[PDB]
Amino acid sequence: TKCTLKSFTVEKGIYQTSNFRVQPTESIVRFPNITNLCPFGEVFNATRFASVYAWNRKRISNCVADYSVLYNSASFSTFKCYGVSPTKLNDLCFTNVYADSFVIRGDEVRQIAPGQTGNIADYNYKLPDDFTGCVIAWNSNNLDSKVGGNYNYLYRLFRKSNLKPFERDISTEIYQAGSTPCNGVKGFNCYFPLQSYGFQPTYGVGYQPYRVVVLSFELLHAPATVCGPKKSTNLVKNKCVNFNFNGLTGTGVLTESNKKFLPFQQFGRDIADTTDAVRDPQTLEILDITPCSFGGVSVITPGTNTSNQVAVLYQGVNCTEVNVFQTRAGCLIGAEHVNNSYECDIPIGAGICASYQTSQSIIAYTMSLGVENSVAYSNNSIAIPTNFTISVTTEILPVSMTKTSVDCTMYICG
Amino acid sequence: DSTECSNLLLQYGSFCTQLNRALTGIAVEQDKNTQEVFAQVKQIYKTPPIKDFGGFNFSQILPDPSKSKRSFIEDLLFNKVTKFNGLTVLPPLLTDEMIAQYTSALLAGTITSGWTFGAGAALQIPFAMQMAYRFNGIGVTQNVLYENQKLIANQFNSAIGKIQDSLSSTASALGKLQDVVNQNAQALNTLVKQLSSNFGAISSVLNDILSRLDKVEAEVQIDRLITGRLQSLQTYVTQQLIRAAEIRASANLAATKMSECVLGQSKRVDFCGKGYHLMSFPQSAPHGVVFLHVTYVPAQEKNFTTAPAICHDGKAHFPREGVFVSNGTHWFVTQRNFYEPQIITTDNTFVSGNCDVVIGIVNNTVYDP
Amino acid sequence: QIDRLITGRLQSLQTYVTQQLIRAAEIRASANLAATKMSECVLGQSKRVDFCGKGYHLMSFPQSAPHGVVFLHVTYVPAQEKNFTTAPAICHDGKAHFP
Amino acid sequence: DSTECSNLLLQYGSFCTQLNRALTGIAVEQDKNTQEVFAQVKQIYKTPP
Amino acid sequence: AYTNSFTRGVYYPDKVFRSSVLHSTQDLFLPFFSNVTWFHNPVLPFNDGVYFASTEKSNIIRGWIFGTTLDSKTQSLLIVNNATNVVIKVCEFQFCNDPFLGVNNCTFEYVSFKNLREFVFKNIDGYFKIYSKHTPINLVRGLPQGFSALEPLVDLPIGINITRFQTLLAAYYVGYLQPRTFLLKYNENGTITDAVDCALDPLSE
Ligand SMILES: *[C@@H]1O[C@H](CO)[C@@H](O)[C@H](O)[C@H]1NC(C)=O
Ligand SMILES: *[C@@H]1O[C@H](CO)[C@@H](O)[C@H](O)[C@H]1NC(C)=O
Ligand SMILES: *[C@@H]1O[C@H](CO)[C@@H](O)[C@H](O)[C@H]1NC(C)=O
Ligand SMILES: *[C@@H]1O[C@H](CO)[C@@H](O)[C@H](O)[C@H]1NC(C)=O
Ligand SMILES: *[C@@H]1O[C@H](CO)[C@@H](O)[C@H](O)[C@H]1NC(C)=O
Ligand SMILES: *[C@@H]1O[C@H](CO)[C@@H](O)[C@H](O)[C@H]1NC(C)=O
Ligand SMILES: *[C@@H]1O[C@H](CO)[C@@H](O)[C@H](O)[C@H]1NC(C)=O
Ligand SMILES: *[C@@H]1O[C@H](CO)[C@@H](O)[C@H](O)[C@H]1NC(C)=O
């Protein structure tokens, strides 16, 4: 109170000093049951990937994503990310996602990086210098290799020019390495563009096959169809809590309700547009979000020159939420409920007043309106005064403010 | 509850304390108004057991102890008169029952003791004698009450009945009180709806800005919302200050009508209701007060020939109080607010000078008692 | 920077001048009430109950005070009552007499 | 009436609507004042010849 | 030829519960007392949004197609009825005037006179949405004077450009949405249960 009034003396009265506000006891989140998880693992577990010149593309859409289900597993020979760190991808939303997958020899896997030059990067799958995405790679010598060599896994050694960013191309032409007129047939200085690693199980690791998947993303003028996890918690009722329902964040007392939302309705509003109820996306419940309890705190004091004692009014609060006394004005705290009525010393509200009285304490009571006096009326009785008092009654009225003037140019600028 | 906004709001300095002080000033003044209107009584006077008021029937306006122990007419008034985004409403200091104790005390004083309880200790007096003083206060002589006491009682009782029917019949009559409730409902709802306004910011939902933007951008967008909400609140507080001055002008008028029309009888023409004033009874009503002003209205006139004075022995006689009138054949004097003929006599009249100077004098006799 | 300080200081001065206009209107209501009490309670005798202080009014004396006026209202208050039997009129010869 | 400003002024919310309510309160009150001052008489009295 | 819409074509503008209250909104809506086109058939424009209704006994109408082309170059939206349920696809078919017998480059796919059914078809740029209602009526071809609100069926996250539509094949009706203000009354149970077309006349205003 001293700091509220900017003074070391506080005169007798009641003063508002702060706002009481029940704190959120815990944090809650609700979103629908985990469904439409994106089929990244169904691509990763496909029976084989293509010859790297014609790498498989799977479009991914209309699904929730958690890429950490992928990159947390040390089962791959590598899992790396580019333009963005792996953790961040669980926050993001996209219009489309792509899984881009292929087979390469263990020595050439190095060509899968931003802005690379070399056979795979230039002629099979061009990652740009500003590539955002991830590269997943593992040895597949137990899956793809065969005795005498397997040829279902070719690479384009030769092309007219370097590919565009993420470009897929099925074009082929014979490479003229010398003076020979090749004219679309194999021969001397006339090399076939789709070279074979000829994968064999006995190979050294640099010649062995590696399966690879690369993750590629776009967010467009057409809105997102992919997003991060539908986060959720337990749903604690009948306490003040921080909450989130389907992205509607707030703080309040989550209470049961009989409010018959129609099947499509998600949120409820009161007359002044303020939210009053929500659907739990994990059940059939409609919960009324009653506002979290709060009110002004005011300090009742006798004048500090006479005593240092004080009492507190928690305005409109119930004493479940906060010597204690529940009243229609709020909780009195630190004042006696004396109930016997007296003249109103310090006003409080709804018929309560409080005073400092004798062994001395602050007391709170229903105010007296003055003494009762039954007038002795009857159809033939009159009272007449036999004597008088002259009286002198002081009355005081203000007449003038202090004449003040401000130069707005000198106050604003100066 | 944003800490980010709370820190930025400091840069506006005292405004957010000053506006809370300005509303606290208005709030305290409502208990000052309610006390200056109702708390004019010195002590809680009480109604006697036998309602022996000379034929008058206050049962509609006195407390009903079987019920908040209001009168019947106070109950009609309490029946016809008809979310927490940092706003708080506060209780009045006096409860509606405490107001009904003051309107009971003011009424029970006014019935049993005339004006005397407004000028000192209350003095009991019989009701048909109090009305004789109140008639004598409007130039109608005491005997015009006593010669008509049952008729005057039936007119008063019937007129109380017509008010009970009138207030029961329509909710449109209490316009002055219902408009106070409606204007404050519109002010508070408009102040709340302005939370949803964008004020040219990216969103009016603060949690959008607190999640979608970095601090250097979020500060600009929050400062737009603060500028908007702060200008909204200043406009509301300024309208409540002006409205509180408008209601204070009505509270000082009600306090003045309480002191003059209830605790007294006012000679201020057409102040305490239309007609000549006799008395008034306060009745409590939510956010206000109702006066039942009781007034005498003259209602069935006759024309007469009149003269400013009358001659006798060449000296001119003027009426002591009253007017000279004639039924064409005989001359009489009467009190001027009710036709009651008296024979013209030297105690009904006073001499001043001679028949020459008075314009429009007439002759006849003046009788000698 | 100066435009922010202009807007802030200017809106703060607008608030002061607006609240001084409203406060000055309350002081005008008090100055008109004082001129009315001066005109009736001093220069006259107000027959208006509880206007010139409690009791029946006799006279009042104005006294100056810094930024205001103090009235010393002299009033008559009746003080020592006795109960009596009473009647509205009295007979004398079938004629009724009133005070 | 230049539309690019009106499309911004809608974003300022209740302000430009409540100012017409405030001035309508003032405008009606000018008739109420002039009614209470002059229309105290019950009939239109007119002076004899 | 034309017919009076009375007070039909109101729909729930947002997924919000409200109770015993009046709420105001501006959106694309069918005006009150508007001339709907009377039918008992060809390709039609979409404008900014369509109202469609029919008095079919047993879901007789086979579906609808919507787009810019309704013939190749890009995926047109295709909608089909199977009893109480609906099949949806977007495809670049190029059929003649009998597309119901023509029966594709597709990029999205989904599955859900005693009676009258009403539908609203709406692009919102925040993708494409559908609203509807089903009611019994008197055995009359003209739309009866009465009130109910069309409820959201689906959101199609498809981004298809639409400027025309056609029906796949009793009395039926077509009208067009306009940017208008409406006042909407909600009962106790969250339900839009009366309305005012705000611009209709000075009393409505
Ligand atoms: C205060 O809260 C408790 C527990 O909810 C309840 O029993 C009591 O009736 C409440 N009292 C008031 C006056 O709100
Ligand atoms: C009221 O307070 C008095 C002391 O002032 C105490 O004796 C009495 O028991 C109280 N009564 C109730 C009903 O609380
Ligand atoms: C009248 O009252 C005064 C005090 O106010 C007292 O001094 C005086 O003696 C009293 N006179 C009579 C006749 O009672
Ligand atoms: C007075 O009025 C009441 C109704 O308020 C009525 O019942 C009663 O008979 C009347 N007369 C008396 C003398 O009470
Ligand atoms: C009074 O006299 C005038 C003129 O004779 C006449 O017009 C008027 O009606 C009379 N009024 C009454 C109540 O007799
Ligand atoms: C009254 O009026 C008539 C016409 O003006 C006139 O003849 C008569 O003498 C007047 N009487 C008096 C007393 O003025
Ligand atoms: C009154 O009577 C006298 C004679 O006694 C006469 O001279 C006078 O004119 C009369 N006056 C009037 C006003 O009739
Ligand atoms: C008047 O008489 C009544 C009944 O005897 C009594 O209650 C009252 O106190 C008396 N008052 C005075 C002033 O003697």
Numbering used by the authors:
A (entry chain A): 299 to 620, 641 to 676, 689 to 744
B (entry chain B): 745 to 811, 813 to 827, 854 to 1140
C (entry chain A): 992 to 1090
D (entry chain C): 745 to 793
E (entry chain B): 27 to 66, 81 to 143, 164 to 172, 186 to 242, 263 to 298
Paper text:
Changes in the spike (S) glycoprotein in these variants are under scrutiny because the S protein has a central role in engaging the angiotensin-converting enzyme 2 (ACE2) receptor to mediate cellular entry and is a dominant target of neutralizing antibodies (nAbs) elicited by either vaccination or natural infection. The prefusion SARS-CoV-2 S trimer is composed of S1 and S2 subunits separated by a furin cleavage site. The S1 subunit contains the N-terminal domain (NTD), ACE2 receptor binding domain (RBD), and two subdomains (SD1 and SD2). The RBD transitions between a “closed” (“down”) receptor-inaccessible conformation and an “open” (“up”) conformation that allows binding to the ACE2 receptor.
